[PDB]
Amino acid sequence: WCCTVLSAFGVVILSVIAHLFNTNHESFVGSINDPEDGPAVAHTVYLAALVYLVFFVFCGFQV
Template identity: 50%
Template sequence: MKPVVSAFNAWTCIVISVFAIVILSVIGSMFASGNHAMMGSTEDPKDGKGVAAAVFGAVVVYGVFLLFCGSQAFLHQRQRAGGEIALR
């Protein structure tokens, strides 16, 4: 199987996805727990659990990106190492 994206794009996507998963997980957990920093102002949303669900949905999307980009990076590594079997 051949990679769809370049090796640079795959590794960039991995780094961005891991960073986004960590940051959004922290933000989502703060909304879910009703943290004063997220829910203390009059302009903040009233339904912290709903906001947390939306943020955790974004975490799932970034998780899918991470799986895809990880598989692309793996394919590039395998191709560079000569481990690819080609039937010609």
């Protein structure tokens, strides 16, 4: 249950971060301390988003 709700929040929170790096948003990659190449830091949390989707659908079978 803790990892289900934690991954349900994980998928939603991480993916919209991946979309706010893939679109080169001003609040994420607009500084000088920014993660450069936003579409390359985006696939780190596309894969991190869907690995929470793995934890979500794997822990969604014990419910």
